[PDB]
């Protein structure tokens, strides 16, 4: 055999991110002293699109805490963030859309996005367009906040983790039919080299386990073990179940 395509992509090679026109990583502010003990006041200077990302981005201008200088932050914009808006980040910031607060300072039932999994993460949860987290409860003894992730799983993080109030902008994107191969081409142009997709049974047996036959068919079960080595782990990887899901959709992921 030869190297399976899914294992070739791990080399990097021609399958890396198309990042040339990207504006940079979108992050919350550094969790500095001013944000730990008070608040920092910022101004939204621009709302911008970036190739490969559904959500809008906001350039927010803050004053440097220690130098005479300006600091430009690039954030994933919540829906409703407008140019000229004041953004408050910190322990003492008010509860309003776009403001960044620690999770322990945010009332239960509030909708939040750009959520730090770890304090100082600068935001790793609920960033795709239209996504958000829901704060379920606080544990003032352990100092931990329980929240519902977009996937449906419930996770607990330290109450010192910061969140942005609101939902990520750009929601509703996946509702519009693409209709055309060319539209998929332009969609993946700004992301990576992963399209079009060739089915494994259309390949030859040399380069894929599903290849070959005088009919196009998988000649063995497509559910494969979690312990399958790379090159064999293709198909339905460690599937708990298959077939059309009937009734309640179970929350995916690990337990």
């Amino acid at each position: 055999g030869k190297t399976v395509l899914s294992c070739r992509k791990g080399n990097g090679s021609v399958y890396q991110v198309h990042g040339h026109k990207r504006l940079g990583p979108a992050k919350l502010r550094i969790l500095d002293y001013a944000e730990r003990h008070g608040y920092m006041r910022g101004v939204v200077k621009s709302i911008e699109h970036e190739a490969g990302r559904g959500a809008a981005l906001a350039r927010v201008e803050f004053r440097h805490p220690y130098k005479f200088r300006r600091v430009k932050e690039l954030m994933v914009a919540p829906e409703g963030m407008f140019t000229g808006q004041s953004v408050f980040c910190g322990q003492k910031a008010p509860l309003a859309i776009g403001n960044v607060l620690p999770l322990g300072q945010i009332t239960e039932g509030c909708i939040v996005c750009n959520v730090e999994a770890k304090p100082g993460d600068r935001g790793t949860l609920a960033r795709a367009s239209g996504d958000y987290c829901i704060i379920i409860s606080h544990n003032h003894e352990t100092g931990r906040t329980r929240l519902k992730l977009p996937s449906g799983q419930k996770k607990s993080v330290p109450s010192t983790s910061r969140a942005m109030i609101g939902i990520i902008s750009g929601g509703g994107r996946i509702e519009k039919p693409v209709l055309k191969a060319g539209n998929s081409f332009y969609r993946f142009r700004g992301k990576r080299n992963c399209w079009p997709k060739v089915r494994g049974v259309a390949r030859n047996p040399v380069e894929h386990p599903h290849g070959g036959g005088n009919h196009q068919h998988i000649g063995h079960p497509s559910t494969v073990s979690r312990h399958s080595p790379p090159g064999q782990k293709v198909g339905l990887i460690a599937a708990r179940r298959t077939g059309r899901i009937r009734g309640g959709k179970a929350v995916k992921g690990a337990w």
Binding site: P78, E79, G80, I97, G130, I167, G172, K180
Partner: protein
């Protein structure tokens, strides 16, 4: 005179992509090329530039919201919730 019976802006596609995909696409296509009301400045002048980027011709405000409409209903519910919670 009305130039198509049912296909409005979708008439650029001819006969080429199925009636139902065309129709579902058409709702959002019409939404994303429409002029939306600007709460600032009180005009119907918000136009989407790129997905999620809405810019007002009148007051030159730029607003992040909605892939194909200016504000998703989830946004309005969240805003009302946040106002109620802040007032609590």
């Amino acid at each position: 005179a009305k130039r198509t019976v049912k296909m409005g802006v979708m008439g650029r596609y001819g006969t080429r992509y199925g009636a139902n995909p065309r129709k579902r696409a058409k709702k959002l296509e019409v939404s994303q090329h429409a002029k939306h009301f600007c709460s600032f400045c009180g005009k119907f002048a918000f136009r989407r530039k790129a997905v999620g980027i809405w810019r007002c011709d009148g007051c030159s405000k730029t607003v992040a919201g909605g892939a194909y409409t200016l504000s998703t209903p989830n946004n309005s519910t969240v805003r009302s919730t946040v106002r109620r919670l802040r007032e609590l």
